[PDB]
Amino acid sequence: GADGVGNSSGNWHCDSTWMGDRVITTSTRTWALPTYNNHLYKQISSQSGASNDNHYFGYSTPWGYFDFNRFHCHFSPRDWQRLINNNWGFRPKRLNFKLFNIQVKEVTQNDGTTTIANNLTSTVQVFTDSEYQLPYVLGSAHQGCLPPFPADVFMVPQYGYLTLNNGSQAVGRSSFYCLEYFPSQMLRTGNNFTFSYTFEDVPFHSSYAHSQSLDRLMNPLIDQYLYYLSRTNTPSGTTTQSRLQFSQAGASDIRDQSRNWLPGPCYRQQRVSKTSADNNNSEYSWTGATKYHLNGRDSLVNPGPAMASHKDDEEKFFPQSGVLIFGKQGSEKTNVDIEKVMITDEEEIRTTNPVATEQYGSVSTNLQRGNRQAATADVNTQGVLPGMVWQDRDVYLQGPIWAKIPHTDGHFHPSPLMGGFGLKHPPPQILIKNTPVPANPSTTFSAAKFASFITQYSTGQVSVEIEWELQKENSKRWNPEIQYTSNYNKSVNVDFTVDTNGVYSEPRPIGTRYLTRNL
Amino acid sequence: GADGVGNSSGNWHCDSTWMGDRVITTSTRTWALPTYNNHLYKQISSQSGASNDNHYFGYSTPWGYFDFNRFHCHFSPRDWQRLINNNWGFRPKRLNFKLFNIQVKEVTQNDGTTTIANNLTSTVQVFTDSEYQLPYVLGSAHQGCLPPFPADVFMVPQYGYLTLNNGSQAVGRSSFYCLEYFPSQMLRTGNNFTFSYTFEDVPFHSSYAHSQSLDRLMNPLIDQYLYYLSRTNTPSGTTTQSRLQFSQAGASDIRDQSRNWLPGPCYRQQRVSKTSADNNNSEYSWTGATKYHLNGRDSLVNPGPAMASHKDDEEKFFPQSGVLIFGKQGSEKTNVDIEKVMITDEEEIRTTNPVATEQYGSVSTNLQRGNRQAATADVNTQGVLPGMVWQDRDVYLQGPIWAKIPHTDGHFHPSPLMGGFGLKHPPPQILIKNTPVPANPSTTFSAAKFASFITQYSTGQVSVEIEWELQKENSKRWNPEIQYTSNYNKSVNVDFTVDTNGVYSEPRPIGTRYLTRNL
Amino acid sequence: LMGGFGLKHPPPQILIKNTPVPANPSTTFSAAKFASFITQYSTGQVSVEIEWELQKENSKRWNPEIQYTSNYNKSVNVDFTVDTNGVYSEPRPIGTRYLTRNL
């Protein structure tokens, strides 16, 4: 699209409509973009000394990108609630994007006095990496997505990436991608950039919780017909004499019943409690946390494989890195106290996946014989096994929406671990930069790189609309399901509202599983 | 319809489907019908002495009728919840009824031993009073409607009615309707009786609560332009000297602001509190309760005109007869203690209708002058006034569904007072009786009325399906609405479930207003 | 895991109940749940037919495969038969793998 200077390049679309089966969440926000790295690509690396587990090598670019991989960039409390309360599941189908009403300003810091003014002509160029030839950054839970609250103006993030490294230094194989080596489209004012995408058949996120659970799944009333090993030894006057007898598992017997499927896999996490007291006093934050390691650098295992966060009656506990944790609007960056964060809870799964903090089961160790007692041992890490079945990490309104499946020789069940939809070809990276403006050059020629540009930034609005599909409920469940509600009682502030000084804020994390489906 | 003896006259339909705009609740239950008044019509009257406010005269009939004027005869907790959580409103549209698989048994109490057996031939006759020529009983909150819970078998109520009376005695004008003077259709087994109805344009029951309220309705930011009387007298050195000055109502001024509409009407009720303590000790149950009176008999004013049950912070109180009160499954018939009942609460209205227990406003009494102070007085009964606006009593799952608008020269806004839909021509009364079976007659003729019949009753199932329309939500409300949920925490029994001895039970009354619409 | 075929949508559950039969009710009305029914049960036959597909053998295996046979020698009772008092009985569990395919 194209037009004039006194012509709005696009209108403001920010609705949300439900169609019974679909529902489209349109949404627009105003943004701003500075000139990063003063227009140059800069090489960047870990700090020489820095622990090995923390080295790196890569580049930062003068390019800034766009991102809305956060559910709340599309759903509004209320809306989300609608969804989350009457749908067995849902998934994204297609999207449409558009930047417009772009405007380029140029600040002038003459002595003690700045003065911003329109640089009409100068441009901002955009380009979408629709061929995925660029290090996909999104999906890395970074923060600089869209504001949950419309009215909020925002700054565009700067693109940076990482290649290979042998400590703080580069290794040859590492590649250096240059963003100008693409065909950016250049916008001036009166210019807009639209583009549209279509998702790929993915599974509806399961937005329901299970009423039955693996173990308790058969019918009480009837005993099976298969037998199991009831007792081993037997009374012989005073002493026992080994004599194995078997029984037919019934209701009273349950624990012993024969089955057909196994809980999901696991990778044991340390348990910490919301109650300061209980927790051993010391620094096992890193030392005790569950991790894995590549090329000799141990990394953390955050968002551990999807597994319930606490047994019955222990909402007080949680994994050291088995859950998602968001900050309460305002919460500072580092070492903030428990009271400043919102920890997610995944009890809803208990029913199928193991509890993060407790071992999977316990396999037998030795082979018993008359002169040898029967061994056994608990298992803290069980990789996928036939017959296992499980549930993936719920979603949360202010959580990630999707993530790119890495291009590898092999993947195994790609639901992104941080939760979300695992996409092979996700929404392409959208980039934006401000074509430089060489400030006054010298009369006599010089072949040096230009270094003195006009100080200036850009701004303008952006809009994103997405169509989601739904799987409606359908249970013959007689008694009421659970629903997500807002507290009745009076409060000094409404949830998901602007305070007295107009600061919007999300009180709690809102999950997705409320409706109840049987297993 | 018709067929044979070994042929099911109908199948069992008991589903419930939602179509986005409609939703059909089908429902079938098994029933039983005895032979009332041993087959005769009996004249009936108050007990000679009995307080005048309690006299009456009328008849009881050998006929039993059918009734489902209770929302839970169609909605199942869950279902109801669906409705109640995502709909600005709804109303009934049409219905279809069918009796079938009728079966007539005949008990034999030979000495110390009864023995029931099939009286194949004998019949049960049904007939619907589709011309409303019979005293419409339904709508009178009687109890003998359908079981909320399907699996429950039930007994059919007996038809009785009331005419005029001058104390315990009849007055001529009083009519005596005879049920045989209709054309009953006679069913034998293999016979079924279907019939269908269509409702009449009625208003969707408002199933939402108001976010604004009459008083607080204008915009804070701006002061009006109309002036009101700020002060009357004025400082004159030591003494005041009358000097009326006026102000322009603003935010701080609010109470004084000029408006455009008035709260609904009222009829003051006594306030009682759920807290035994507070309540004055004595018997003002009748003496103090709000009532009205015709032909010299004071009757009670139950379900008073629709008006909020308590101001902010007083959920502890309520009208003496301004609310609906249901029994907790089991609760005996008389003088049962507060702990045995469930009292409905209509706070949701506060916003438009007056509070039941507190006066409407206060009008001025006298005309003031120098030598006369300004009078004023509170008003406890305000009949409809121009500009008044209000809300009708909510509904409740186990509440009435509708009621017949009395045939009179004049009605005023017919939403039935007990709540529900006010119908001009409601679902016709359906009646049923068992054609008598003269037990062995004497060889020699006698012209006396037959008095010795075969002892026998009937049974068989009945089905009712109804189509309801809906008005879906649609508010730009950002923050979450309130929804109806079931408690998370463990409990010895699930709500709306059968206990250990299979006794279904409704824990609490469930209203209808949860979703929030602005005023 | 107990072995068998894993089905996503298996043969639907089939249910059956006997519509109750309220035994003699009282002349005067009562809104209580009916509790006195006619004592009675049902009976009748049921039939199930199923079509199974097969994958026939096909090995160039020269020497004889193993097969499932019934013992030659005399016995007081035939296997999978009714005893003297007509009580059918399955002597042993019979598997499925007998024919031999290469890996």
Task: Please answer yes or no on whether C1 and A387 come within 8 Å at the CB atom.
Answer: yes
Backbone angles phi, psi at B80, to 5 degrees: -40, -50
Residue of A nearest to B484 (CA): A483
- Of the candidates A160, A121, A201, the one whose C-alpha atom is nearest the C-alpha of residue A42 is A160
Which of chain B's residues have a Cβ under 8 Å away from the Cβ of A497? 478-479
CA distance A257 to chain C (A): 11
Q: For an interface test with A, give the residue of B21, B350, B481, B489 to mutate (most A CBs within 10 A).
A: B481
Q: How far is B191 from chain A (nearest CA, A)?
A: 31
Whether the Cβ atoms of residue B462 and residue B95 lie closer than 8 Å to each other: no
Minimal Cβ distance to B36: which of C23, C27, C37: C27
Q: How far is CA A299 from CA A177, B197, B227, B360, in A?
A: 26, 71, 72, 70
Name the DSSP class of B386: T
| Residue A507: Cβ within 10 Å count | 19
Mutate to test the interface with A, among B482, B499, B504 (most CBs of A within 10 A): B482
- Inspect the interface and report whether the beta carbons of B30 and C19 lie closer than 8 Å: yes
Task: Say if CB B364 and CB B374 are below 8 A apart.
Answer: yes
Give residue A491's identity as a one-letter amino acid code.
S
Q: Are the Cβ atoms of B78 and A475 closer than 8 angstroms?
A: yes
Q: Is A173 left (phi over 0), alpha (psi -120 to 50) or beta?
A: alpha
Technique that determined the structure: cryo-EM
3-state secondary structure B255-314: HHCCCCCECCCEECCCEEECCCCCCCCCCCCCCCCCEEEECCEEEECCCCCCCCCCCCCC
| Nearest of A162, A145, A201 to residue A401 by alpha carbon | A145
> Which H/E stretch holds residue A84?
helix A77-85
- End-to-end, the C-alpha distance of chain C in Å comes to 22
How does B286-296 read in b/e, with b if 16+ C-beta sit within 10 Å? eeebbeeeeee
- What backbone torsions phi and psi does residue C30 show, to the nearest 5 degrees? -155, 130
Do C31 and B107 make contact, defined as CB atoms within 8 angstroms?
no
Chosen for mutation from A214, A215, A258, A260 (greatest number of chain C CBs closer than 10 Å) is A260
A contact residues 33-92, partner B, Cβ 8 Å cutoff:
76-78, 81-82, 85-86
Dist. CA C95–CA C103, nearest whole Å: 20
**Assigned token pair, A192:** 């807009």
CB within 8 Å of C44: residues ≥ 6 apart = none
Q: Report the alpha-carbon distance of residue A438 to residue A455 in Å, rounded.
A: 9
Query: How near does any CA of chain C get to the CA of B412, in Å?
Result: 35
- Give the Cα separation of A79 and A238 in Å (integer): 72
Question: How many angstroms separate the CA atoms of B351 and B519, rounded?
Answer: 9
What is the distance in angstroms between the Cα of A218 and the nearest Cα belonging to chain C?
13
> Is B181 buried (19+), middle (13-18) or exposed (0-12) by CB count in 10 A?
exposed
CA-nearest residue of chain C to A386?
Answer: C1
CATH superfamily of B1-519: Parvovirus coat protein VP1/VP2 (2.170.30.10)
Sign of the torsion angle spanned by Cα atoms B249, B254, B257, B259: positive
Would you call B478 and A85 a contact, using CB atoms and an 8 Å cutoff? no
Under a CB-based contact definition with an 8 Å cutoff, are residues B392 and B419 in contact?
Answer: yes
Residue A489 has, within 13 A of its CA and on its CB side, a CA count of 0
Q: Which helix or strand (DSSP H or E) is residue B231 part of?
A: strand B227-236
Backbone φ and ψ for B320, nearest 5 degrees, come out as: -70, -35
**Which structure tokens are listed for C19?**
């519509």
* Contacts (Cβ under 8 Å, ≥6 apart) of A296: A52
Facing B153 at nearest CB: one of C20, C24, C27 = C20
Residues of B in contact with A496 (CB under 8 A): 478-480
C103 in reach of chain A (CB within 8 A): no
Q: In this structure, are residues A419 and A303 in contact, taking their beta carbons and an 8 Å threshold?
A: yes
Spell out where A21-162 has E strands: 22-25, 28-33, 42-45, 57-66, 87-106, 117-118, 124-128, 154-155, 158-162
Please check whether residue C2 touches A, CB under 8 A: yes
d(CA A391, CA A265): 10
Closest residue in chain A to residue B14, using alpha carbons only? A476
CB atoms within 10 A of CB B448: 5
C1 at A interface, C-beta within 8 A: yes
CB pairs under 8 A between A and C: 10
Question: Is A497 part of the contact surface with chain B (CB cutoff 8 Å)?
Answer: yes
Q: Phi/psi class of residue A393: alpha, beta or left (left: φ > 0; alpha: ψ in -120 to 50)?
A: beta
Residue A88, classed as helix, strand or coil, is strand
Q: Which residue has the tokens 């890495």?
A: A406
Alpha carbon of A285: minimum distance to chain B alpha carbons (Å) = 32
Q: A317: how many CB neighbours lie within 10 A of its CB? A: 19
Element (H, E) at B402: strand B402-404
Strand blocks (E) in A390-456: 402-404, 421-423, 430-434
Quote the DSSP letter at residue A512: S
| Inter-chain residue contact C2 with A387, CB threshold 8 Å | no
Neighbouring chains of A at 3+ CB pairs under 8 Å are B, C
Distance from CA of A153 to the nearest CA of B (A): 18
- Distance between CA atoms of C10 and B172, rounded to whole angstroms? 71
How many residues are present in chain A? 519
Q: Is A496 on the interface with B (CB under 8 A)?
A: yes
In this complex, the residue of B34, B143, B144 whose CB is nearest that of residue C25 is: B34
Is B152 at the interface with chain C, CB within 8 A? yes
Of the candidates A416, A420, A388, A399, the one whose C-alpha atom is nearest the C-alpha of residue A205 is A420
Quick check: C24 and B158 CB within 8 A? no
Contact (CB<8Å) B34/C23: no
Please, what is the Cα angle at A377 between A373 and A379, to 5 degrees?
165
Q: Which of C29, C36, C38, C42 to mutate to test the interface with B (most CBs of B within 10 A)?
A: C29
User: How many residue pairs bridge chain B and chain C with CB atoms within 8 Å of each other?
Assistant: 52
A262/C1 CB distance under 8 A: yes
Q: A386, C2: Cβ pair inside 8 Å?
A: no
Chain B touching partners, 3 or more CB pairs below 8 A: A, C
Within 10 angstroms of residue A174's Cβ, the number of other Cβ atoms is 15
| Residue A491 CA from chain centroid, whole number | 31
What are the chain A neighbours of C2 within 8 Å (beta carbons)? 226, 258-260
Which residues of chain A does C1 touch, with a Cβ-Cβ cutoff of 8 Å?
Answer: 259-262, 386-387
A259 in C contact zone (CB under 8 Å): yes
Q: Do B480 and A495 touch (CB under 8 A)?
A: yes
* Bridge partners (DSSP) listed for residue C32: none
Q: Which residue does chain C place closest to B64, by CA atoms?
A: C29
Rounded-to-10 torsion of CA B491, B494, B496, B497: -130
CA distance B493 to B500: 9
Distance, first Cα to last Cα, chain A: 51
Cβ-based contacts of C22 with chain B (< 8 Å): 30, 32, 153, 459
CA-closest candidate to residue A65, choices A406, A491, A462: A462
- Cα(A356)–Cα(A345) distance, integer angstroms: 11
Q: What whole-number distance in Å separates Cα of residue B163 and Cα of residue C42?
A: 49
| Number of CB pairs, chain A paired with chain B, less than 8 A apart | 79
B370 burial class (0-12, 13-18, 19+ CB within 10 angstroms)? exposed
| B287 touching C (Cβ < 8 Å) | no
Residue B30 belongs to what H/E stretch? strand B28-33
DSSP structure class, residue C57: -
Pair B303, B418: CB distance under 8 Å: yes
The Cα of B116 is separated from the nearest Cα of chain C by a number of Å equal to 7
- How distant is the Cα of A354 from the closest Cα of chain B, in angstroms? 21
Kindly identify which residue of chain A lies nearest to residue B514, measuring between CA atoms. A485
| Structure tokens given for A267 | 């990778």
Rounded to the nearest angstrom, the minimum Cα separation between A13 and chain B is 14
Rounded CA-CA distance B372/B364 in Å is: 13
The angstrom resolution of this structure is 8.5
Q: Does C7 touch chain A (CB under 8 A)?
A: no
